[PDB]
Amino acid sequence: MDLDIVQREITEHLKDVLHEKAIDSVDLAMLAPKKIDWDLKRDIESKLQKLERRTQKAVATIIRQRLAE
Amino acid sequence: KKRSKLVLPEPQISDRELEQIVKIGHASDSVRQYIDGTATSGLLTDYTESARANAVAARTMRTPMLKDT
Amino acid sequence: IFKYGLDNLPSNRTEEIFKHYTQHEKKFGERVGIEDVIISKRKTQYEKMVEENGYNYDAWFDYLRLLENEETDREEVEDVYERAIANIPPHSEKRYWRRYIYLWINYALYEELVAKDFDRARQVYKACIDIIPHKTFTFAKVWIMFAHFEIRQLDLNAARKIMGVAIGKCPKDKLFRAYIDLELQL
Amino acid sequence: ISQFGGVSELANVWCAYAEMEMKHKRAKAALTVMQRACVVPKPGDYENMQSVQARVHRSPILWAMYADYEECCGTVESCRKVYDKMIELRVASPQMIMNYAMFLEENEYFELAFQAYEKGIALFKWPGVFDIWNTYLVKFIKRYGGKKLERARDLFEQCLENCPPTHAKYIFLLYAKLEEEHGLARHALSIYNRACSGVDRADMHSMYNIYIKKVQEMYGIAQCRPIFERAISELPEDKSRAMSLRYAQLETTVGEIDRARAIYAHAAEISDPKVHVKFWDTWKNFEVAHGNEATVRDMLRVRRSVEASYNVN
Amino acid sequence: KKERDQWQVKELQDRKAAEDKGLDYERVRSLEMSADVTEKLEQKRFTSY
Ligand SMILES: O=P(O)(O)O[C@H]1[C@H](OP(=O)(O)O)[C@@H](OP(=O)(O)O)[C@H](OP(=O)(O)O)[C@@H](OP(=O)(O)O)[C@H]1OP(=O)(O)O
Numbered sequence: 001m002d003l004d005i006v007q008r009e010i011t012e013h014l015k016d017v018l019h020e021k022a023i024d025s026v027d028l029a030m031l032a033p034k035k036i037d038w039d040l041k042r043d044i045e046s047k048l049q050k051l052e053r054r055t056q057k058a059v060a061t062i063i064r065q066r067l068a069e
Numbered sequence: 070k071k072r073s074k075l076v077l078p079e080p081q082i083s084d085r086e087l088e089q090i091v092k093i094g095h096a097s098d099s100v101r102q103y104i105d106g107t108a109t110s111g112l113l114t115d116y117t118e119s120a121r122a123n124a125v126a127a128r129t130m131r132t133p134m135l136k137d138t
Numbered sequence: 139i140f141k142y143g144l145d146n147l148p149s150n151r152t153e154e155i156f157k158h159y160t161q162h163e164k165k166f167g168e169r170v171g172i173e174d175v176i177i178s179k180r181k182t183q184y185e186k187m188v189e190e191n192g193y194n195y196d197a198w199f200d201y202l203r204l205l206e207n208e209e210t211d212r213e214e215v216e217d218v219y220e221r222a223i224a225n226i227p228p229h230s231e232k233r234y235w236r237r238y239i240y241l242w243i244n245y246a247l248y249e250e251l252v253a254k255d256f257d258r259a260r261q262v263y264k265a266c267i268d269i270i271p272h273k274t275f276t277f278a279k280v281w282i283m284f285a286h287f288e289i290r291q292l293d294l295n296a297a298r299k300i301m302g303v304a305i306g307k308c309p310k311d312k313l314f315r316a317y318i319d320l321e322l323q324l
Numbered sequence: 325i326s327q328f329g330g331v332s333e334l335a336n337v338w339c340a341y342a343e344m345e346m347k348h349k350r351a352k353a354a355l356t357v358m359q360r361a362c363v364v365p366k367p368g369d370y371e372n373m374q375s376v377q378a379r380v381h382r383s384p385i386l387w388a389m390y391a392d393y394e395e396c397c398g399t400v401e402s403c404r405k406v407y408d409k410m411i412e413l414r415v416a417s418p419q420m421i422m423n424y425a426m427f428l429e430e431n432e433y434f435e436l437a438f439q440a441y442e443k444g445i446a447l448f449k450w451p452g453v454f455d456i457w458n459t460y461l462v463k464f465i466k467r468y469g470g471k472k473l474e475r476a477r478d479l480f481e482q483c484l485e486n487c488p489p490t491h492a493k494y495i496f497l498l499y500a501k502l503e504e505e506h507g508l509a510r511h512a513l514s515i516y517n518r519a520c521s522g523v524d525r526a527d528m529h530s531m532y533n534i535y536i537k538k539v540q541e542m543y544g545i546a547q548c549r550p551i552f553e554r555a556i557s558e559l560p561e562d563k564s565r566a567m568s569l570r571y572a573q574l575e576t577t578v579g580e581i582d583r584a585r586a587i588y589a590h591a592a593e594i595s596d597p598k599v600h601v602k603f604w605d606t607w608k609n610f611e612v613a614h615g616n617e618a619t620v621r622d623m624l625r626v627r628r629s630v631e632a633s634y635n636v637n
Numbered sequence: 638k639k640e641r642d643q644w645q646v647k648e649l650q651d652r653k654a655a656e657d658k659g660l661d662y663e664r665v666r667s668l669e670m671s672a673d674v675t676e677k678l679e680q681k682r683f684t685s686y
Contacts, residue, residue, distance in 0.1 A: 001668065003660050004572040005457045009465070017534050022570055024577050026124065026545075028094035028117075031087065034542045036233075038277065039509040040199065040240040047247050047492075057291045059323050065292075075556055075590045077583045087546055129579065133170070134616050160478070165442045169435050176475050196510050203475065384671050452667045452675055636682035 149182050156182065177208055188221075195237050198222040202244060212253050219245045223265075232275040239277055242266045246283070256291060263287060276306075278312040285320065294324065328376050329528075335383040342389060344371065351397045358390035369488065386416050390571050391423075400431050403599040418448055425459070434467055445482075454491050457483050461498060470506035471604060477502075477594055496531070513539065520554075529563040545574050556587075561594045581614045590624060597631050 057064070082090070101116045140159035144152055160175045167175075184201040187194055202222065205215045222241045227234040242262065249259035263284040270277060281304040289296035301317045304310075328334045338361040345354040362381050370378040380386065387410045394403040407424040410416045421444035428437040441460040461479055464485070468476070482497040484581050487495055496519035503512040516535035523531050532555045540548045552571040556564050568591035575584040588607045595603045603625060611620050648666075655662035667675070 001455075001660070001665065003455065003664060004458075005179055005462050006494045006498050010501060011499065013497045015532065017531050017537050020533060020537050022573055024573060026577055027121070028091060028098055030544060031094075031546065032091045032544045035236075037240070038542075040237065043203075043476055044240070044243065044247070047251060048142055050251065051247075051283075051290070054290055055286050055588060056323075058292060062289070062294055063324060067398070072561075072594055073590060075553055075586070077553075077586045080580055080583065082579070084546060085233075128579075129613070130579065130618060131614060131616050132581065134618055161446070165439055165446060173472075173475060176478050179478075182475055196508055199508065362660045382673070384670075414676070417669050417671055447672045449675060450677060451664060452672075455664065455668060 144178075149185075152182075177204065192225045193227070195222075195225070195241065197297060198241060200263075202241075202248075205308075206248065206252065214255070215248065219248070226269065228273050230271060231303045232277075235270075235277070239266075239270075239279065242269075243283065246287070250287065256287075261288065272307050276304075276308040276310055276313075278310055278316065281313055284287065285317070289320065293316070325377075330569060331376055331380050331383050332385065334376055334380045335386045338380070338386055339389045342393065346393065351393070355390075355393055355397065358386070358393060361386055362390050362409075363422075376584070382413065382415060382419060384410075384415050384420070387413075388420060389419070395427055400407075400428075400433070403427060407440070411447065414447060416444075416447070418444060418452055419449075421456060422459055425463075429463070438464065450486065450488055450624065451491060457487075457495070461495070465498075465502060470502075473502070473506050484518075484522070487522075488523055493519075493523050493527060493531070497534075509542070521558075529559050529566075532559060532567070545578065549573070556590070565591050565595055565600070565603060572606075572610070576614065581613065584610065584614070585619065588623075592626050593630060595630070596634060597627050598634065 098117055101113065104113075106113075140155055140162060141176045143155040144159070147155070156175075156179050160172075160179055163171050163175050167225075181201070181204065184204070186195050188201070191197070198218075201218060205218060219241070222312070223245065225238070225241075227238050229235075236263070242265075246259050246262040249255055249262050253259075263280065266277075266280045267284070270280065281301065285297045285301040285304075288294070288300060297320070301313070304313045306318065328337075330378055338357065342354040342357045342361075345351075345357060364381050365373060365378050366371060372378065387406070388482075391403065391406045391410065394406050398406075400524075400567035400631040407416070407420075407427070411421065411424075421440060425437040425440040425444075428434070428440060441456055441463075445460070446455040446501070448456065461483065464472070464476060464479060480495065480502070483495055484492060484499070487523050500512050500519070503515060513535070516531065516538060520528055520535055532551070535551055536548060536555075539551060552567060555567045556571065559567065572584045572587040572591075575581070575587065590608065591603065591609065597604045607623060611623050615623075651666070652662040655665045
């Protein structure tokens with residue numbers, strides 16, 4: 001029987017994450033590799049890009065009517 | 070059997086202080102990696118590596134003695 | 139019997155009725171029923187853990203996402219946002235606002251994209267600027283978004299007023315950069 | 325009609341009857357024999373309800389034979405009747421619950437396959453359910469991913485609400501993977517915060533270092549501090565030393581030399597210098613590097629106290 | 638005695654086979670048995686005068 005099927009999927013945790021030895025280094029990324037907004041910003045992007053494309057479309061109409069005169 | 074509670078002094082570089090440090094660091098890093106050049110790049114320093122060199126030089130530090138006894 | 143229980147008892151009890159109802163329905167029901175009861179459980183569960191704290195913003199961000207994802211009626215999604223917004227951080231320090239402020243941004247995004255009621259969306263953005271201290275700190279995020287919201291609807295004469303007051307109250311590098319970039323694109 | 329020594333003897337006769345009919349291609353008769361074999365007695369159907377013929381319908385061998393013929397020769401709806409009745413009577417083993425779901429899944433009745441798994445979980449008590457939950461939770465994710473996530477959460481919560489701590493290790497990591505790739509960040513971290521206390525002591529360090537790595541991977545070594553202090557205070561003393569060495573390495577590589585000492589000095593009271601010599605070496609190297617004459621005398625003071633915690637015995 | 642021994646050798650060689658396969662015999666064993674077998678097993682497993 002495939003008595004351990006869950007282990008096939010969590011392997012990326014088991015290999016690199018279930019154990020780690022040590023570190024002795026520092027850098028400006030390692031001090032703060034992400035910022036506390038990041039997941040909230042992530043989930044806005046698919047909506048906020050629609051606004052961005054509308055902004056380029058909107059600004060094109062503003063220009064077009066401002067040069068129509 | 071029994072163990073003391075872990076008590077630690079407050080960090081010298083507090084979290085609010087580190088926020089400022091990473092703000093300056095990311096800006097200074099970005100404006101380096103922004104741009105290179107074919108001959109006039111020798112005006113620039115490779116700041117981030119010099120900062121690493123400075124940090125390992127500053128890594129030796131010691132508590133002062135003889136303030137009392 | 140389960141539905142009669144939920145219909146006639148306050149939701150501070152009923153946790154046993156719910157868990158057993160979402161056992162009964164989860165076996166003997168069917169998909170449209172199974173998901174309906176799990177949503178109503180989750181809404182009740184978020185509503186509880188909101189009453190436990192209020193400042194559990196991640197409970198709001200889930201709750202708002204859930205109600206948006208299930209296409210629930212505008213008045214109820216709008217109402218729950220108003221309850222979210224009342225949890226103003228008790229601090230003058232930007233660190234605590236950085237998570238909070240996306241309640242306002244998502245509320246405006248909901249009002250602009252989903253409700254498509256731009257007058258109401260304007261009132262959301264305006265109410266951001268009346269709440270942020272501005273003297274102690276600012277979010278350039280809201281000023282940029284509110285400026286571009288008035289570039290949409292073809293009102294650059296308002297967008298310039300919004301963005302110029304941002305420069306006026308609080309010179310900040312992203313505010314200058316974003317206004318300059320807007321004027322270049324125009 | 326005759327007597328037998330026990331249920332399993334009789335069940336073999338019923339199977340042998342359907343067996344020969346199937347080999348002679350009387351498939352509809354073979355099913356008829358199994359239907360006639362499996363029919364549950366009503367309370368008046370026999371002279372006593374504990375006779376061998378009155379109990380033979382509880383034999384799982386008989387229902388296994390019946391359901392297999394329906395898969396080969398029946399309709400999908402008729403197979404569900406057999407399996408559902410087999411589940412109803414407690415007859416179904418966990419393995420043949422998973423066969424039922426495999427059958428529905430193979431016929432693309434995915435949502436009914438989950439009801440098959442669901443009542444599998446209602447019948448059996450841990451650890452018997454463990455492979456039902458394993459196959460359920462991976463199939464659900466492979467079927468829907470994030471598209472049913474709030475329902476997926478309810479499975480993992482329903483699993484972990486009764487999971488024991490010897491089995492929960494894989495479920496917590498599987499659950500965190502869901503919340504990692506689709507969920508909000510603090511949810512995944514809250515799973516790890518649960519995992520490093522819901523997993524049993526013998527592997528609890530392997531949950532702490534996950535939580536350490538994942539916080540460090542996103543919020544850096546500054547925000548990582550408080551969950552080291554939980555670890556040092558909670559995991560058993562051999563790993564609490566190991567965490568103390570790793571924590572002191574961070575505070576020295578940052579530069580909180582005063583905090584580094586208090587990590588060592590707190591670990592030093594559970595570290596016999598007569599045997600744990602590698603700990604006292606790492607502290608001795610630290611104090612000759614970042615220390616001074618005053619604090620070295622304090623290291624040697626505590627060293628000569630903790631050895632005196634044992635030599636007097 | 639023989640009948641008694643048949644169950645003993647059956648479970649022991651199955652355990653050996655399960656152990657030879659590198660599988661926890663107890664999980665593999667519990668996979669095969671009906672819920673009734675569990676239920677009898679779950680049943681089996683100074684406040685005042
Ligand atoms: O004002 P600046 O020095 O140009 O820095 C800003 C500013 O950072 P702070 O105000 O927190 O110091 C933004 O923050 P908000 O004004 O929008 O609150 C921040 O945006 P986030 O807070 O979302 O990080 C943004 O970063 P980004 O460029 O990634 O949008 C960053 O701008 P610069 O990186 O251009 O300096």
